[PDB]
Amino acid sequence: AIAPVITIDGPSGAGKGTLCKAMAEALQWHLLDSGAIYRVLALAALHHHVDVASEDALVPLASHLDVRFVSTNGNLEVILEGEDVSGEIRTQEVANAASQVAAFPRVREALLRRQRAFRELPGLIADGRDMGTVVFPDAPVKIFLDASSEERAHRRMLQLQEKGFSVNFERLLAEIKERDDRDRNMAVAPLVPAADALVLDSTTLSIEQVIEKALQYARQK
Numbered sequence: 154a155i156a157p158v159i160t161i162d163g164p165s166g167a168g169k170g171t172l173c174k175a176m177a178e179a180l181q182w183h184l185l186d187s188g189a190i191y192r193v194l195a196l197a198a199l200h201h202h203v204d205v206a207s208e209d210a211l212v213p214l215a216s217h218l219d220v221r222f223v224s225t226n227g228n229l230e231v232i233l234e235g236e237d238v239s240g241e242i243r244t245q246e247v248a249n250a251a252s253q254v255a256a257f258p259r260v261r262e263a264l265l266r267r268q269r270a271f272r273e274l275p276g277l278i279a280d281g282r283d284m285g286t287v288v289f290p291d292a293p294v295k296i297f298l299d300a301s302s303e304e305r306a307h308r309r310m311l312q313l314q315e316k317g318f319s320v321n322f323e324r325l326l327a328e329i330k331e332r333d334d335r336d337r338n339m340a341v342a343p344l345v346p347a348a349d350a351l352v353l354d355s356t357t358l359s360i361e362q363v364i365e366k367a368l369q370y371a372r373q374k
């Protein structure tokens with residue numbers, strides 16, 4: 154007793170986000186956005202003066218987390234413990250922590266069941282860095298979008314350039330390069346594609362083409 158899926162994962166900046174809003178739009182498939190979750194988890198950790206450094210304090214917060222996602226409106230507002238926090242989880246600090254919050258074995262666990270319960274007819278698209286390596290290791294579909302460092306950098310340090318912020322290519326470069334040698338050497342929660350994941354790059358690829366591509370693989374299998 155279960156419904157179909159998909160597993161569009163990959164590193165930040167890869168544009169796996171907007172890709173999902175098609176997978177899920179053209180298909181009307183429940184769009185599960187992970188990253189956010191952690192981002193709320195981290196936020197909640199922050200305001201709850203919970204020591205995001207202490208793995209011995211990030212599991213309770215998770216296993217009783219009040220985080221849900223809106224329906225079909227303008228885009229997708231994430232809600233927390235009773236109030237909206239979209240713009241706040243998209244902060245340039247919440248992530249530094251949301252990067253800490255997701256680097257602990259037990260964390261994921263408590264977040265685990267909280268995710269697997271997202272599946273439902275017809276299907277559930279899943280943005281993330283592991284929707285195959287762990288959560289949906291049975292998803293007929295398994296896309297793994299990817300993008301170089303210099304580029305994924307642009308794909309961000311620029312994406313926020315016309316959003317009223319200041320940032321330098323040099324920094325964010327290092328910043329993402331950092332998470333890589335982290336996410337990589339990471340032990341658990343690597344970032345390597347699912348042994349049957351369609352490795353799909355997008356550096357010199359267009360977003361209109363990634364969609365194009367992706368979908369091809371979709372209904373196919």
Ligand SMILES: Nc1ccn([C@H]2C[C@H](O)[C@@H](COP(=O)(O)O)O2)c(=O)n1
Pocket residue numbers: 165187188189191192248251252253255280281282283284342
């Ligand atoms: N499935 C996921 C999604 C995000 N993450 C991490 C990567 C980021 O530091 C943070 C949220 O990522 P994102 O900015 O893509 O929402 O949590 C993860 O480890 N596994």
